[PDB]
Amino acid sequence: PSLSKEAALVHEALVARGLETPLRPPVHEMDNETRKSLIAGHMTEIMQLLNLDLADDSLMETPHRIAKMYVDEIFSGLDYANFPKITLIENKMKVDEMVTVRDITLTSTCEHHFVTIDGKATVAYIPKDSVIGLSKINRIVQFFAQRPQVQERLTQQILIALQTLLGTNNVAVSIDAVHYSVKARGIRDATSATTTTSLGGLFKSSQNTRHEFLRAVRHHN
Amino acid sequence: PSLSKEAALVHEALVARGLETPLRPPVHEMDNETRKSLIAGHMTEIMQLLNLDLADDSLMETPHRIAKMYVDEIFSGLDYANFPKITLIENKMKVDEMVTVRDITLTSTCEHHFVTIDGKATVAYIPKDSVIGLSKINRIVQFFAQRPQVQERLTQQILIALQTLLGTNNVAVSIDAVHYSVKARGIRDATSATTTTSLGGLFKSSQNTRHEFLRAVRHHN
Amino acid sequence: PSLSKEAALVHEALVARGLETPLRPPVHEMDNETRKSLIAGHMTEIMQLLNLDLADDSLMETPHRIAKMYVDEIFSGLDYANFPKITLIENKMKVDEMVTVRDITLTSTCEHHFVTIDGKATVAYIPKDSVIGLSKINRIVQFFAQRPQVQERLTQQILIALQTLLGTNNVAVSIDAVHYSVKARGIRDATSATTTTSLGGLFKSSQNTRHEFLRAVRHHN
Amino acid sequence: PSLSKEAALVHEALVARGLETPLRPPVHEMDNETRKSLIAGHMTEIMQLLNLDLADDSLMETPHRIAKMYVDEIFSGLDYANFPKITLIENKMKVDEMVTVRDITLTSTCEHHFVTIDGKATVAYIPKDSVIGLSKINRIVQFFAQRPQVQERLTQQILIALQTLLGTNNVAVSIDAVHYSVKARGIRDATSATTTTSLGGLFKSSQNTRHEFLRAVRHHN
Amino acid sequence: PSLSKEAALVHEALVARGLETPLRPPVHEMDNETRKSLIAGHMTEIMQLLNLDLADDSLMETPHRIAKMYVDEIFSGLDYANFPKITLIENKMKVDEMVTVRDITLTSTCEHHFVTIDGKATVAYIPKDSVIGLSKINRIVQFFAQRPQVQERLTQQILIALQTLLGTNNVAVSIDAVHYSVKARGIRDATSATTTTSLGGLFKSSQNTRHEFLRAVRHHN
Amino acid sequence: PSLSKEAALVHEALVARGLETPLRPPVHEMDNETRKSLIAGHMTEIMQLLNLDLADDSLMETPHRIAKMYVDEIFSGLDYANFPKITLIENKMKVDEMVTVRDITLTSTCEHHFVTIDGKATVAYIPKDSVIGLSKINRIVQFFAQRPQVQERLTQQILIALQTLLGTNNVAVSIDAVHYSVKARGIRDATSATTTTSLGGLFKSSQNTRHEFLRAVRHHN
Amino acid sequence: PSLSKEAALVHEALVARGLETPLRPPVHEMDNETRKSLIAGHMTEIMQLLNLDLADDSLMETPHRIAKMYVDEIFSGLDYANFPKITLIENKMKVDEMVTVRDITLTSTCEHHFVTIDGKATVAYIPKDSVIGLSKINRIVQFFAQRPQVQERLTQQILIALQTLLGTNNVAVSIDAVHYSVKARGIRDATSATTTTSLGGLFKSSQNTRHEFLRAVRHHN
Amino acid sequence: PSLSKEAALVHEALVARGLETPLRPPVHEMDNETRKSLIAGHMTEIMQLLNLDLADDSLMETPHRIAKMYVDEIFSGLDYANFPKITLIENKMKVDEMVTVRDITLTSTCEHHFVTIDGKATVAYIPKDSVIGLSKINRIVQFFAQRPQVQERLTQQILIALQTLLGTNNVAVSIDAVHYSVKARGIRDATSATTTTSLGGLFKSSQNTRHEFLRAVRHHN
Ligand SMILES: Nc1nc2c(ncn2[C@@H]2O[C@H](COP(=O)(O)OP(=O)(O)OP(=O)(O)O)[C@@H](O)[C@H]2O)c(=O)[nH]1
Ligand SMILES: Nc1nc2c(ncn2[C@@H]2O[C@H](COP(=O)(O)OP(=O)(O)OP(=O)(O)O)[C@@H](O)[C@H]2O)c(=O)[nH]1
Numbered sequence A, B, C, D, E, F, G, H: 001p002s003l004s005k006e007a008a009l010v011h012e013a014l015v016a017r018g019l020e021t022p023l024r025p026p027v028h029e030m031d032n033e034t035r036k037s038l039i040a041g042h043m044t045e046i047m048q049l050l051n052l053d054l055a056d057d058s059l060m061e062t063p064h065r066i067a068k069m070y071v072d073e074i075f076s077g078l079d080y081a082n083f084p085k086i087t088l089i090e091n092k093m094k095v096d097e098m099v100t101v102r103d104i105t106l107t108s109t110c111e112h113h114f115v116t117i118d119g120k121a122t123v124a125y126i127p128k129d130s131v132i133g134l135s136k137i138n139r140i141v142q143f144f145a146q147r148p149q150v151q152e153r154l155t156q157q158i159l160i161a162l163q164t165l166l167g168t169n170n171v172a173v174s175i176d177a178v179h180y181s182v183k184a185r186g187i188r189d190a191t192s193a194t195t196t197t198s199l200g201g202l203f204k205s206s207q208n209t210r211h212e213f214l215r216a217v218r219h220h221n
């Protein structure tokens, strides 16, 4: 058991363009449980360098929690052994109109601070030879989001990965989000938010198809 | 008594486009009541296979309910013996402008999980030689909605049917919906929603007409 | 005392187009208070057929009311003797831009079921040599509304009516409305609504004008 | 086949208090199809009395429609032969706290003008020995709603009927609604709305229980 | 490995009150993959019994999907092997005031129809010796929500379980939920929603405390 | 320069009640700029255990930002050298009613995951001999907000701090917050929120006062 | 002391286009206080003509009140001695983009019934050689508002005045408003409203500029 | 230590277009503390001119406060010493689509009265060779804002300054603000607001890009 056929295509396709998350070759496959006990230590250290009484029955566990949260959760998207199982059906209905999925839950982390990123993504595409199972578009967004990110790049990734799996370039990804490393820290701006978009295929070349999308983006409930 | 003049025209027209819902020739007409007893038999088993104390007064009747639900309710739209009665009125006012019926209630089920689909549909058209009774639009939407469905197809069928019955191509359908097989299970995205559309006639070729429609789409109360 | 100049013009213009509500020549003018008596009698017969105890002090006067409501109220628009008193004012300010009246209260009845029609209307036009008194637009919408109606036609009449009076073809009418014979009966669609429009003059030929209008249409408070 | 056991109890329990809708002993059972043909003739008359060219392909069917709508739909609750099938389950959970079913859809007709009544009902009860199937409180409300009504009484019947089937006085009912006979005609008050309630059992004696309810009433979405 | 300490206590606590979901002694431990393949079989039947072309590449998988869904998902709460890991921390701050967790996401299924139940819960308690890790309340709620349910009971269990684990009877649970077997099928009430509550400890005996709770329940965003 | 008079009292006050955040005797005052460098290197380690390319001109600096954040930012509230400069003004207007500050911006971190906490807090007190300057309330909240926290404890600290500085027991603190370690990870509850309250003096003893406060709590814009 | 340079130009500019409010040459300068005493008299008369007990301590002063209101208040824009002191600043910043002041409070009187007109005005212009003080657009609007008006015209005067004072024609003005002599009297239309617009310069010739404006017109809060 | 490279480029770039705030050569660098004592002196003087009892322990400090505020806060943007530390990253992801930062908290003061200005700014740019870190756009906006301003100029400075640091003319800036010197003083308009914008690069020449921006402007929550 290695990877998946789609995960390969997708990963490679992102490296070609250099839109892959800056990683170093894994080299040797250091036990996964081993990386948690190690990471925990470094935390068990940072907490002491801050004078946090690790004798406390609550703070005590913290280090193992943060470790687990890193290896197994908020960053699981860095291992392609986690790429969502993609499923498509043949386009017999012949849908030549865009299918949209709006207000997709996106939970991420800026790579600059390792601080929360709360945002919504709106994906859209024009089926060609096949139609993707709706939920997939969800799982894919969340996949790339579970990584130390940069908004402008996270968007590009979602765009390319979908084109790849879809077999078209007629895909559009738009992400609207808030950076707590901007809201609860430093400039502490309570009301701003950043919106990034990546247009492919007709979405970028056709003035008409372009705006037909942008207009239907950014909705509440 | 066999069927109706509209039900056939619409049905045959949909098979021509291979847009009908994947069915097998009925073959013989086994007693409608007989099916509910059989389908009832199986579920009785599945519930046993789940360790569900079928002695209990409440669960006891469940099997019969599901069967009834499948045969006589949520899938009723599979039998054109239930196609809504269509009634038209000559277009003497010569209405050359599009009529729009928005926020139409649409209840359905995904054929992949046999799970609830909740959304609203929007239909518009341009009367040619006849205007359809407003409640017919509603009724046709709810007819095809009452089947094991796929949102991309469901939108297509409604289009074609109304085109057939109305005798024009100038018809536009636009469904918005939430798949619980995508919200309460699996990826569990609690905020996402899928928007599909089917544009015909001028609603597809006329840049102007097209947008006029789309712009008036997606409304709350 | 016959009718009114405008009334006549408007009436004839609508008969010219055949956009008059389907009526039969009055013939003789059978006492108005005499029809109320015959109609009240028929309602009495119907109520009895419904096993309603007409002996009851409350149900007792229902017939008289329903008869009254029919002849002297909800259908009062069927007699041009009720046409609003129009009044204009020379266009000395030289208004060459459209004037708009949005969210006009429109009460009407569906001629198919004699049930309530609840909707709002938006009227706009471009002054030529005269400017109508604002409340006039209102009175006229409610005049035509007070008849057994068909939305598509109710809209055509108002358009033409104002065209006649204003003396321009630059008038647009749009009606958003809810049909209770849809909502509370039959399909019972609690959320749906129908929007029908009628564009004239520049509003129909000028893409620019046409959209400037439609955009300002459909508002709340 | 006569009626149902519960349909009886309720009817009886309703006549006892004199809260039944003013009805006359049916006498002979006049064929149902016979009434609709007799009532239709009556509308055919009233329409000719309004100078409605019944020759028109549209206005032509109106009579049979109204007739069918009277006998088969909007008043079908005047026949206990339509009473919903009540079903209950043993209160093994011993739920000694109230169960509320809010914003229940209620469609009705005022007996004074045979005009539309648009409202929402909120029902609550404290289970005693049995817990009613949720969709039953909905069915009973709509049952009595489908009759020529007076809001004040409409509330009363629901309350009683429920108390009866439940075997408890602990039931509270409250309806919130708009009479179009007051909004689209006559005083034409577009904003008013009427609220009427009927507190039973502890909902009327317990100062605490009472308010707990009232406060939990009148909600939007 | 059998179960967990807490899992047993809560399970017994419920059976002792007769609040455990009506089940049957599992008997033998038949292979888990074995049930899906069986369940999958029957479903394959029912689908055939409905004339659904199992030949189609999409519906082809459905039987295996529903099987998976039943055993491995939506009903996953029936196997106490999945009870969330509970973790508390000595009440050293002596929090003598109630802690409230609102708008908790709740997904369930009605044992009566095996249909979706969309709802939100509001849990609150008053710390005695221990404070529960916030997310545990959320976990316990979705734990019992993943079973063939009945709102009135679901609310009960959640209370009892919490009381058990927390070591106090001062715990209130309130669920507001929409049953789709009542909104997209049957009476089809597009707006009603049921609200059930279960008060314990002071939340039931103390008038003040009881109301402090109920007043802050039912919130949007 | 050691500290401030206020800072001491408050700190002593909290220690006395055991409501101080779990810490360890500082011992020696190792260079603040030396701790940053060690913490930074430890992050450098974790990032290399995740397979991140620290070579990237962007990820390159993260280790320093985080080190800066943890020492000179998100936890600054651990050092009372940073305690806000409180300033009072004799109560000559004899204000004997409560002063309430609502929707105070509160930015915090959970000591269980070292993750974001987004919330607002409302604080009210009854001026005795002095009236605190409105912004100090804000400052004081944020002071205790910047620390590895537990909401329950965060609430108490703020309360006692204020009591102490105000020379009264009549203050009330309420924090309504959202934990991302609950929203964007784990159970992932997109909608839940936690409300905690701390009542002192009258706000706890007088049912009259108590509710006056609680009701005026939880506001939007 | 006679008038003001600007006031003069603006006045003449308006007289030139014939957009001045229908007035008569003052002739002689009758004392201002003298007019109040005369007007008051007439009101005293009319009120007696309404059988109002002018003996009552309250109704007694109404006469002097209406007079004072007519002379020194609601119609004060009828005297250019009140025109606002305009003030401009050289456009060194070279702003070649439009400046928009939206939602400006506009209070006027319909000359037809001497009844309240409630609305909001939106003004936009493209700076040429000078930039007007913001507050001025406000003042100027209110200046022409305090007069017996006609919406279509009150809009014209604003445009022209503004163009004149600004030394440009790139000016746009839009007023959205309610006329109580239409809401609470006559047709009594509780929900309708009027919108009037006057486009100048590029706002009238440039398709682009036009829409950019219209689109940012009509906002709430 | 003098200033910063960027601070320089920007400052000059502005001096070239004359968009710098009207300032006089510093000449000498009088001690900063020295200024606060003199400025405080004048205020101590002005308050005595207004018969304000400076004896009062509260009004006492005020002079120093207003001194401090002028020199160290609301005007700190007048000394490039406070210019934010910009930090970019190479555009390897080649983002050829605009990046939008909406609803930036902007706090300023009109130079005409030295009174509050509360608003929000929206910025967009198309990455050329570099990508600005997000929080930067925020601090740049807040830099220039902290000055005796003029909304039409404040906008320009933000445009120019950004362009210069970005290396592109493809930078757009909008400022929706409320001038209190207009709301709570003079004309006192409690509802109006001013909107200004500055378009550069494609945002100005390309009709497409231009609207794509404008449309996405003016948002709430
Ligand atoms: N395009 C489309 N996809 C649908 C529709 N209904 C369900 N689906 C998709 O069908 C897929 C189910 O694919 P499977 O391969 O069986 O996997 P699964 O275990 O059901 O996967 P998840 O549902 O994502 O947990 C998903 O992608 C659903 O989102 C529908 O109307 N249209
Ligand atoms: N373009 C972009 N910038 C991001 C993203 N996430 C964090 N940033 C920005 O990266 C920058 C961090 O820059 P640094 O120079 O290390 O400075 P800092 O001390 O973190 O600065 P502040 O965040 O303003 O306090 C800031 O501009 C963050 O807001 C992201 O997804 N995209």
Ligand SMILES: Nc1nc2c(ncn2[C@@H]2O[C@H](COP(=O)(O)OP(=O)(O)OP(=O)(O)O)[C@@H](O)[C@H]2O)c(=O)[nH]1
Residues within 6 Å of the ligand: B086, B087, B131, B132, B133, B134, B135, B136, B139, C110, C111, C112, C149, C150, C151, C152, C179, C181, C182, C185, C186, C187, D061, D065
């Ligand atoms: N085009 C149009 N149709 C209308 C209007 N008002 C009511 N109708 C439709 O006219 C039809 C009545 O057709 P019938 O054939 O008598 O059938 P019915 O039993 O009355 O129809 P249902 O309402 O579906 O029960 C329905 O489709 C109504 O919804 C209206 O203003 N315009």
Ligand SMILES: Nc1nc2c(ncn2[C@@H]2O[C@H](COP(=O)(O)OP(=O)(O)OP(=O)(O)O)[C@@H](O)[C@H]2O)c(=O)[nH]1
Residues within 6 Å of the ligand: C061, C065, D110, D111, D112, D149, D150, D151, D152, D179, D181, D182, D185, D186, D187
């Ligand atoms: N209490 C009550 N009154 C109702 C109800 N429905 C209609 N009504 C009232 O019954 C009255 C009809 O009384 P009538 O004496 O016939 O007078 P009318 O000309 O029909 O009355 P207006 O509606 O004022 O035009 C009105 O006051 C209606 O508003 C209802 O459910 N409850």
Ligand SMILES: Nc1nc2c(ncn2[C@@H]2O[C@H](COP(=O)(O)OP(=O)(O)OP(=O)(O)O)[C@@H](O)[C@H]2O)c(=O)[nH]1
Residues within 6 Å of the ligand: A061, A065, E086, E087, E131, E132, E133, E134, E135, E136, E139, F110, F111, F112, F149, F150, F151, F152, F179, F181, F182, F185, F186, F187
């Ligand atoms: N009472 C309280 N609990 C908190 C607070 N912040 C985090 N927690 C809870 O502390 C717990 C962490 O307990 P652990 O046993 O380490 O479990 P975990 O895997 O980290 O927790 P989850 O995965 O989130 O269920 C969870 O219940 C968190 O949600 C807080 O302010 N107050």
Ligand SMILES: Nc1nc2c(ncn2[C@@H]2O[C@H](COP(=O)(O)OP(=O)(O)OP(=O)(O)O)[C@@H](O)[C@H]2O)c(=O)[nH]1
Residues within 6 Å of the ligand: B061, B065, D087, D131, D132, D133, D134, D135, D136, D139, E110, E111, E112, E113, E149, E150, E151, E152, E179, E181, E182, E186, E187
């Ligand atoms: N009290 C309660 N009733 C429920 C719940 N879920 C489903 N039900 C009700 O159980 C009943 C099903 O009763 P049956 O006698 O089988 O009738 P049915 O044809 O399924 O009923 P209808 O739903 O009215 O069509 C209905 O009242 C459902 O709405 C639940 O959580 N609580």
Ligand SMILES: Nc1nc2c(ncn2[C@@H]2O[C@H](COP(=O)(O)OP(=O)(O)OP(=O)(O)O)[C@@H](O)[C@H]2O)c(=O)[nH]1
Residues within 6 Å of the ligand: G086, G087, G131, G132, G133, G134, G135, G136, G139, H110, H111, H112, H149, H150, H151, H152, H179, H181, H182, H186, H187
């Ligand atoms: N265009 C612009 N005008 C501003 C700005 N700030 C204040 N103003 C306007 O500048 C003007 C001050 O003009 P002055 O002639 O001194 O008169 P004033 O007594 O201050 O004016 P009023 O505010 O009408 O009382 C007013 O129109 C203010 O509203 C700003 O940023 N831009």
Ligand SMILES: Nc1nc2c(ncn2[C@@H]2O[C@H](COP(=O)(O)OP(=O)(O)OP(=O)(O)O)[C@@H](O)[C@H]2O)c(=O)[nH]1
Residues within 6 Å of the ligand: C086, C087, C131, C132, C133, C134, C135, C136, C139, G110, G111, G112, G113, G149, G150, G151, G152, G179, G181, G182, G185, G186, G187
């Ligand atoms: N176009 C315009 N009409 C206005 C304006 N103000 C009042 N009016 C209209 O001027 C008319 C007065 O005309 P009249 O012939 O005296 O009739 P009336 O009895 O006052 O009119 P009703 O209000 O319909 O009763 C009405 O149509 C008012 O609504 C205004 O600013 N613009």
